[PDB]
Design a protein around this ligand. Structure first.
Ligand SMILES: Nc1nc2c(ncn2[C@@H]2O[C@H](COP(=O)(O)OP(=O)(O)OP(=O)(O)O)[C@@H](O)[C@H]2O)c(=O)[nH]1
Ligand SMILES: Nc1nc2c(ncn2[C@@H]2O[C@H](COP(=O)(O)OP(=O)(O)OP(=O)(O)O)[C@@H](O)[C@H]2O)c(=O)[nH]1
Ligand SMILES: Nc1nc2c(ncn2[C@@H]2O[C@H](COP(=O)(O)OP(=O)(O)O)[C@@H](O)[C@H]2O)c(=O)[nH]1
Lengths: 434, 428, 51, 60, 42, 434
C-alpha cells in the first residue's frame, strides 16, 4: 500500500542499487532467484508478487553503456530482476553531461519513461521515487537530469528522493567533474525534492578509521550506502513507536523550498573484532553520529549551523533513552543550531535490528542514521565553484560540449544558479536581527 | 441513562484510546472477544455508555479510529484488545499526512472527514441520551491536530449542546518528536479555544517525570505512558458509570469547573501512584491521597502549580472511604496553601466520591485542576512559534496546500488572547 | 496482554537479544577469518604463477 | 568485483534475530470494500428529554 | 471484623504478588510467533 | 557513579600502567581478557561493564614510540583494552620537553583528547583523572604538559591527581633529564591538583633492605608503586569504616594552593621469609611509615617539617588503634609539624585487604599508604635547580630544544618560577611569630 520506485542511473546508481537490492533481498528474506525459502507484507514496499512466489523489484536500471548491466544480467541476480527492466544503451555518454542530456538521450528516454509508467500503473499509493546516481559522468548526470525533467512533467505531485555521490573534494577521478556536477546541480535544484549527498572520501576515512579495513573497495563504499538507504526507507516497511513517512522526511528537513541537500551519517560502523568493548547505547551512538568524523561528506560542521536533523533509530531502542540522548546533545556548545528553530530534531523508531551482509560490518542491536540539513555544505559548493572557475577561465574542455550541441550560455546559467544557492545558504546562515 | 462517543484521531490518539478501551474492558469485565465475564452486576448495570449491545452479549466499543496513515489501526487490531471494535468504525486512506496541519485540515484529511462524520452520526443517533464526545489526539504533529480540530468543529456545529472532552498530548519543552510542533499546535489550540468544553493537556515530559521520580521505573515505554493517561481518562467518567454518593458527570464538572468560557484547559492527575518496592511501606488512605494528589510531582502536564493561582479544582475519588477525611483534608489543603488559590472564587474544591475502585486497589482519586500554570505552556510555544515564524521557515508546504499568511497571525493573536486572561487571573 | 506490560519481560528480552548478538558476532568472526584464509590461498596462487 | 554483490550464500546464522512486521491485511480487505456512507432514510425514534413514553394520568 | 477484613485483603495482595512472580518466571522460561521470524530462519 | 579514568602517558607510565592494571584486575576479579570469571559493584569505578557482561579498563596508554604500547597489544592483556584506547605515535619525542608542548605532539594530542571524551561520557561522577607520567624522557614531560593544560580547561574543578615520577638525585638515565624537569614543573604548578612525586632512587633502596630482593628490575619497582596507587584509589572501589575519596585528599593535604607535591610511603613492604617474624600491628606499620629510611623519595624528613600528613590504612585496622598509633607518634619530638597545622594526620581505614600479585610484596593482613606535604622536598627541588643552572650556565644541550620550538626564553622564564616554588616552601615553614 506504501511503496517507492527505485531508479538507478549510470554505473554509480547501478552499483549502489546492486548493493541496495542485495540488502533489501536479505532483510525481507527473498532468495537470489526471487522465490522465497520453504515458507508478511514488507515485500510490498519494494517488490511485487506475480502470484507464483517470484517477487520482482520496482527497479529501473538505466545505463547508456553495457557491461555494467551485463554484469547484473550474467551474475547471480539474473532471475531476481525482470530481464527487460535492465535497460541497456549502445554508446557511452562519455563523461559528457550534455551527451547524456542532448544527443544520446533520445534513443532511450522513451523506453525509460515507458517502464516508469508501467511500474507506476502497478501501484496503489506511490509514495515516491528513489533516484540513485552520481554528480559525475554523462550517464550519472545528464541522463539523470533529463530523466528528472520528464518525471517533473509526468509526476508533478509525486515525491522524488535522491541519493547522489558528490564529487571527491580533494582528488576526484575525472577532469570534467566540476562541469558536469554544476550542470546537474543547476538542473536538479528545481526538480529534485530531497537529495542526500554522499562523498567518497568520507566513506574512505570512516572505513579506514572505524571499520578497521585498510583495504576498502567499492564493494564496501556503497555497501554502506545500501545500509543507510534501507535505514531511511524502512519505517514504511516495518512498524515503530514513532514511524516516519517519506513525505515526513521532506516536511521536516527542507525548510526553504531550495534547501534540499542534506548530508547523512550511519551509526555503529563498528568492525566485528571491535564491538566486544562498547555498550553501543543510544547516547553514545547519537554522539558517534554527531562526532565530526563519521559524516558522508568531507565538510566540517563546525563551520556552519545545523537547521534540521532527523534521527532514524532501528532496532531495540527506547524512545526515552532517545530523550536522554537528545537532552545530552543539546547542551553541548560545540554543536550549534540555528536560532529560528528552537527544536530541530526528528525521532523515528523502528523495531528492526539491521541485517548484516557477509562482509565487513558487524550487526548491532541499535542503529541510527542521522540526516542533517547543515549550512556547512556551502563550503563544498564554493570549493567546487573555485574548481569550475579555474577550469572555465579559458574555455578548457568546452569544445567537446559545444561541438556535440550544448550552447555556451548553459554554463553561465549554471554559474548564476549555484551562486544563488551560495547566497541562499548565507542568507539562511546569518541570524535574525529584526 | 447516559452516553458518550469515543473519537480517536492520529497515531497517539489511537494508541491512548486503545489503552483506554483495554482499561475499561477489564474494569467492566469484558474479555477481548466482547463477551461478559464479570463478578458484580454493577458492571453490567451501566455498561451501555461506552459499549453498544450486540447479538448475544458481544459488546462493541463506540469509538471511531481515524488516521491518514493506514498503519496504526492495523497495530490496534493486532493489539491485546484488537478484535472488539466494529470494522466499519475503522476509516483511513493511503495518503501522506506528513505531520502537517494544512494537510490534515484542507486536503486529504478534509477528504476523509465526511466519511468519518457518517460513522460519528450513526453512533450518535444510536443513543438514548448522549452526554457528548471525547476525542483523543496529540496537538504536536498533524492528523490528531488537523483532522482532530476539523472533526471538533464539525461535531460542534452538528450537535451544539453536548459536552466535548478532548484529551490532547500538548508538546513538551524538553524535547520534540517532530519539528513543526509549534506550527501544528498554535493552530490546533486556536481551534480548541472556541469549540471544546473540556480540554485535558498532557505533556510527555511530565509523563516521564512521573515514570521516573514516582514510579521508580527503569525503562518506561510508550505503553506505560498511555496507561498513565488511560488511568485519568477512565477515572474522570466514573460517576456516570458506577453508583456512589455525590455523583458527577461531565457537564457537572464543566459547569463546576470553567469560570469564563475560554479558560477550559485542565491538568489531569492520578495519584495512588507508588512503586512496587514502596507499595508495602504505605498506609493508603484519603489524607495521603490528597498529599500525592496536590503534590506537584504526580501531575500529568509539565507546568508547576506554584507559579500560579489555582482557579478551581476537582477530586473524583473512588472507593469505600469515609467522607470526613476528604472533606476535612480539602479544607486543610485550602487553608495550608492559600496564596495559590484564588480568593474571588471561594470553596474552590470539588469532591465526587464514586463507590467502585479500580482493580488491584481499594481507593483511588482522579485530579482535575484549572491551574493558571497553563500560562507557561502557552507562552513557551508562543515563543517557539514566533521564533519559527519571524524568519518565514518551515511554512512553504502550508502555503502550497493553501494557507494564507494572515491565518497564522490570527492563530497566534488568538493564543496570545488566551494567554491574556491567565495573566489577569494571576493578578485579579 | 501480559507480554506487552511487565517490564521484566522487556529487561529479560534485552538479555536474550544481547546474548544472541554476541553468539552471532562470534559466527561472523569465524566467517571473516575464513575470508582471511581464502585471501592467503589467493596470494600463494599468484606467487606460484609469478614464479 | 561486481560478483561480490551476490556471492557468499546466506547462512542460517546471518539474519537479524527478530522481525517485527507491519501487516496490512485488515486495511487490505477493508479499503476496497467501502468506508461506509450514510445514504439512508432515518429510523431514529421520537426521542424526548427525560419522558420517553410518559403517563398523562393527571387529567379529567 | 474491619480488622479481620483488612488482614484478609493484605494476604490477598501478598498471594497475588507470589502468583505474579511464578507467572513471570514461567513466561521468562523461554517464551515465537512464526511471523516474528523472517523465512531466513523459517 | 564512583569513577576515575587513568591516562598513562609515556613509557614509565605505560609500563607502570601495565603493573597498576594487572593489580587492579587480580584484586577486583576481571580475568586477563575479562568476562568476570565470577561464579559486587567494584569494577564500576576503574572499569566499565560493557555488553555480554564484559569488563573494559578506564585508560588511554599514550606514547609517541610504538615499541612499548605494542608489547601490550601482543601480550596477556591484549583483550582488555579496545584497540582505539591505546593511541601510539610514529617518531619518538627524543628526550625533549620541546617535542612535547611543541612538535611531535600537536598532532596526536587531538585524538587522545577525543578518546578521553568518550572514556568520560560513559561515566557519571569522574572522581579524578589519575595521570601517571615520569619527569624525564620528553613525552613524560612535554606531552603531559599539553594534556594537563587542555584537561584543566575542559574538565575544570574535576580532580587531577598525577603520580609523576620525580627526577633522581644521583643515578639519572638522561643528561637532558635536568632541563625537562625545570620546564615540566612550570605546568604541574599551574594546571595540577595533588601531583604525588616519587623518586626511583628510594624504591631501589627499599627493594634492597625490606623487600630483600637484591637486584629486582623495573617491573619490581612499578609493582610497589601499584600497591601505593591502589591504596589511594581503594576507598572509591571497596568498603571502609572511615572512607576517603580523591576530593578529600585534595581538601586535606594541600595547604596553600601551590604546595601540591606530597610524598608517599607504603606500609608492610616485608618479604615472605621475614614476614613470618613480625606482628605487622597497626602501630608497628605507622611507626615505620614515618621512618626516614623508607620514604619513597630520598629527601629525608629529619631536615624538614610536616605541613599535613595523610594516612590511608587497609585491612584489619581496629578504628580505636589508629588514634593509639597517631598519639604514640605526635608525642615524639623527632617528627616536627608546622605550628600552623594543629590537628595532625587524617585517618583512612578500608577493609578490603591488600591483594598479592604472585611476585614480591608478601601476604600482610594489614597496610597503610602514607602521604605528606613535607617541608623538605625542597632539598630535591634545589638539587634540580643547581643542575638546570650548571647546565644553562654554558647554554648546553639547548640548541636542540630551541631548534624544535621553545624560544630560548622558556628556560629562563620557567627557572624563575621554579625558584619561586623554593621560596614558598621556605615561607610556609617559617615559624608564626605574629
Ligand atoms: N559503490 C560504488 N560506487 C561507484 C561505483 N562506480 C562508480 N561509483 C561512483 O560513481 C562516481 C563516478 O560516476 P561517473 O562519473 O558517472 O562514472 P560513469 O557513469 O561510469 O562514467 P563513464 O566512464 O562515462 O562510464 C565515482 O566517483 C564513484 O563514487 C561502483 O561500482 N560502486
Ligand atoms: N617504573 C618504571 N619507571 C621507568 C621505567 N622506565 C623508565 N622509567 C622512568 O622513566 C624515566 C625516563 O623514562 P620516560 O620518561 O618514560 O621516557 P619516554 O616516555 O620513553 O620518553 P622518550 O624517550 O622521549 O620517548 C626514567 O628516569 C625512569 O625513572 C620502567 O620500566 N618502569
Ligand atoms: N502517551 C502516548 N503518546 C504518544 C503515543 N504515540 C505517540 N505519542 C506522542 O505523539 C506525538 C506526535 O504524534 P503525532 O505527530 O500527532 O502523530 P500523528 O497524529 O499520526 O501525526 C509524539 O511527540 C509522541 O510523544 C502513545 O502511544 N502514547
Amino acid at each position: 500500500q506504501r511503496e517507492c520506485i527505485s531508479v538507478h542511473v549510470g554505473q554509480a546508481g547501478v552499483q549502489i542499487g546492486n548493493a541496495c537490492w542485495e540488502l533489501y533481498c536479505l532483510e525481507h528474506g527473498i532468495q537470489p532467484d526471487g522465490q522465497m525459502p520453504s515458507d508478511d507484507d514488507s515485500f510490498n514496499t519494494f517488490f511485487s508478487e506475480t502470484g507464483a512466489g517470484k517477487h520482482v523489484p520496482r527497479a529501473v536500471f538505466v545505463d547508456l553503456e553495457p557491461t555494467v548491466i551485463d554484469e547484473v544480467r550474467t551474475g547471480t541476480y539474473r532471475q531476481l530482476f525482470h530481464p527487460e527492466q535492465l535497460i541497456t544503451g549502445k554508446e557511452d555518454a562519455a563523461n559528457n553531461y550534455a551527451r547524456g542530456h542532448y544527443t544520446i538521450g533520445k534513443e532511450l528516454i522513451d523506453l525509460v519513461l515507458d517502464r516508469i509508467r508501467k511500474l507506476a500503473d502497478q501501484c496503489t499509493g506511490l509514495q515516491g521515487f528513489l533516484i540513485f546516481h552520481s554528480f559525475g559522468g554523462g550517464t550519472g548526470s545528464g541522463f539523470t537530469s533529463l530523466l528528472m525533467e520528464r518525471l517533473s512533467v509526468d509526476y508533478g505531485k509525486k515525491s522524488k528522493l535522491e541519493f547522489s555521490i558528490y564529487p571527491a573534494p580533494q582528488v576526484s577521478t575525472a577532469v570534467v567533474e566540476p562541469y558536469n556536477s554544476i550542470l546537474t546541480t543547476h538542473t536538479t535544484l528545481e526538480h529534485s525534492d530531497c537529495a542526500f549527498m554522499v562523498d567518497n572520501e568520507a566513506i574512505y576515512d570512516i572505513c579506514r578509521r572505524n571499520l578497521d579495513i585498510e583495504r576498502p573497495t567499492y564493494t564496501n563504499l556503497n555497501r554502506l550506502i545500501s545500509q543507510i538507504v534501507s535505514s531511511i526507507t524502512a519505517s514504511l516497511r516495518f512498524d515503530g513507536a514513532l514511524n516516519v513517512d517519506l513525505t515526513e522526511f521532506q516536511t521536516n528537513l527542507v525548510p526553504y523550498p531550495r534547501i534540499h541537500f542534506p548530508l547523512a551519517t550511519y551509526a555503529p560502523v563498528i568492525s566485528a573484532e571491535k564491538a566486544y568493548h562498547e555498550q553501543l547505547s543510544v547516547a553514545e551512538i547519537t554522539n558517534a553520529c554527531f562526532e565530526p568524523a563519521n559524516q558522508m561528506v568531507k565538510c566540517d560542521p563546525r563551520h556552519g549551523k545545523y537547521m534540521a536533523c532527523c534521527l532514524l533509530y532501528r532496532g531495540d531502542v527506547v524512545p526515552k533513552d532517545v530523550n536522554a540522548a537528545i537532552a545530552a546533545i543539546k547542551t553541548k556548545r560545540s554543536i550549534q543550531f540555528v536560532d529560528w528553530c528552537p527544536t530541530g530534531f526528528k525521532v523515528g523508531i523502528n523495531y528492526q535490528p539491521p541485517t548484516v551482509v557477509p562482509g565487513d560490518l558487524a550487526k548491532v542491536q541499535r542503529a541510527v542514521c542521522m540526516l542533517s540539513n547543515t549550512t556547512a555544505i556551502a563550503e563544498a559548493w564554493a570549493r567546487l565553484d573555485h574548481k569550475f572557475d579555474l577550469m572555465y577561465a579559458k574555455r578548457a574542455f568546452v569544445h567537446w560540449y559545444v561541438g556535440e550541441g550544448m550552447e555556451e550560455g548553459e554554463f553561465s546559467e549554471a554559474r548564476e544558479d549555484m551562486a544563488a544557492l551560495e547566497k541562499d545558504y548565507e542568507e539562511v546562515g546569518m541570524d535574525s536581527v529584526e | 441513562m447516559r452516553e458518550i462517543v469515543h473519537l480517536q484521531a492520529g497515531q497517539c490518539g489511537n494508541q491512548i484510546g486503545a489503552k483506554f478501551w483495554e482499561v475499561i474492558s477489564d474494569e467492566h469485565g469484558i474479555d477481548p472477544t466482547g463477551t461478559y465475564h464479570g463478578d458484580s452486576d454493577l458492571q453490567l448495570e451501566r455498561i451501555n455508555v461506552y459499549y453498544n449491545e450486540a447479538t448475544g452479549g458481544k459488546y462493541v466499543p463506540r469509538a471511531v479510529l481515524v488516521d491518514l496513515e493506514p498503519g496504526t489501526m492495523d497495530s490496534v487490531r493486532s493489539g491485546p484488545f484488537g478484535q472488539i471494535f466494529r470494522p466499519d468504525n475503522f476509516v483511513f486512506g493511503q495518503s501522506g499526512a506528513g505531520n502537517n496541519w494544512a494537510k490534515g485540515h484542507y486536503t486529504e484529511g478534509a477528504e476523509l472527514v465526511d466519511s468519518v462524520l457518517d460513522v460519528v452520526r450513526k453512533e450518535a443517533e444510536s443513543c438514548d441520551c448522549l452526554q457528548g464526545f471525547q476525542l483523543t489526539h496529540s496537538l504536536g504533529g498533524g492528523t490528531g491536530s488537523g483532522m482532530g480540530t476539523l472533526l471538533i468543529s464539525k461535531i460542534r456545529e452538528e450537535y451544539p449542546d453536548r459536552i466535548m472532552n478532548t484529551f490532547s498530548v500538548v508538546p513538551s519543552p524538553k524535547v520534540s518528536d517532530t519539528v513543526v510542533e509549534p506550527y501544528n499546535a498554535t493552530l490546533s489550540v486556536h481551534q480548541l479555544v472556541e469549540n471544546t468544553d473540556e480540554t485535558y493537556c498532557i505533556d510527555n515530559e511530565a509523563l516521564y517525570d512521573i515514570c521516573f521520580r514516582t514510579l521508580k521505573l527503569t525503562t518506561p515505554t510508550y505503553g506505560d505512558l498511555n496507561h498513565l493517561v488511560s488511568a485519568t481518562m477512565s477515572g474522570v467518567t466514573t460517576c456516570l458509570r458506577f453508583p456512589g454518593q455525590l455523583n458527577a458527570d461531565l457537564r457537572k464538572l464543566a459547569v463546576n469547573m470553567v469560570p469564563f468560557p475560554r479558560l477550559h484547559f485542565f491538568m489531569p492527575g492520578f495519584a495512588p501512584l507508588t512503586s512496587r518496592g514502596s507499595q508495602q511501606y504505605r498506609a493508603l488512605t484519603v489524607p495521603e491521597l490528597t498529599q500525592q494528589m496536590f503534590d506537584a510531582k504526580n501531575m500529568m502536564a509539565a507546568c508547576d502549580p506554584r507559579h500560579g493561582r489555582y482557579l478551581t479544582v476537582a477530586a473524583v475519588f473512588r472507593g469505600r472511604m469515609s467522607m470526613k477525611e476528604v472533606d476535612e483534608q480539602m479544607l486543610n489543603v485550602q487553608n495550608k496553601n492559600s496564596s495559590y488559590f484564588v480568593e474571588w472564587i471561594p470553596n474552590n474544591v470539588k469532591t465526587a466520591v464514586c463507590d467502585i475502585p479500580p482493580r488491584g486497589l481499594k481507593m483511588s482519586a482522579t485530579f482535575i485542576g484549572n491551574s493558571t500554570a497553563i500560562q507557561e505552556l502557552f507562552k513557551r510555544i508562543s515563543e517557539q512559534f514566533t521564533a519559527m515564524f519571524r524568519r518565514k521557515a518551515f511554512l512553504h508546504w502550508y502555503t502550497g496546500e493553501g494557507m494564507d499568511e494572515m491565518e497564522f497571525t490570527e492563530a497566534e493573536s488568538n493564543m496570545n488572547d488566551l494567554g491574556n486572561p491567565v495573566v489577569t487571573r494571576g493578578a485579579c | 496482554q501480559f507480554r506487552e506490560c511487565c517490564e521484566e519481560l522487556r529487561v529479560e528480552l534485552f538479555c536474550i537479544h544481547q546474548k544472541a548478538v554476541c553468539e552471532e558476532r562470534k559466527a561472523q568472526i569465524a566467517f571473516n577469518e575464513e575470508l582471511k584464509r581464502q585471501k592467503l590461498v589467493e596470494e600463494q596462487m599468484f606467487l606460484k604463477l609469478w614464479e | 568485483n561486481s560478483s561480490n554483490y551476490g556471492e557468499f550464500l546466506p547462512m542460517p546464522q546471518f539474519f537479524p534475530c527478530y522481525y517485527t512486521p507491519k501487516e496490512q491485511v485488515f486495511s487490505g480487505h477493508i479499503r476496497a470494500t467501502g468506508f461506509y456512507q450514510n445514504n439512508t432514510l432515518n429510523t431514529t425514534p421520537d426521542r424526548t428529554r427525560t419522558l420517553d413514553f410518559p403517563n398523562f394520568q393527571h387529567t379529567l | 471484623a474491619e480488622k479481620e477484613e483488612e488482614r484478609r485483603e493484605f494476604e490477598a495482595g501478598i498471594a497475588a504478588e507470589k502468583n505474579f512472580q511464578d507467572k513471570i518466571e514461567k513466561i521468562l522460561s523461554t517464551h515465537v510467533l512464526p511471523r516474528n521470524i523472517h523465512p531466513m530462519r523459517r
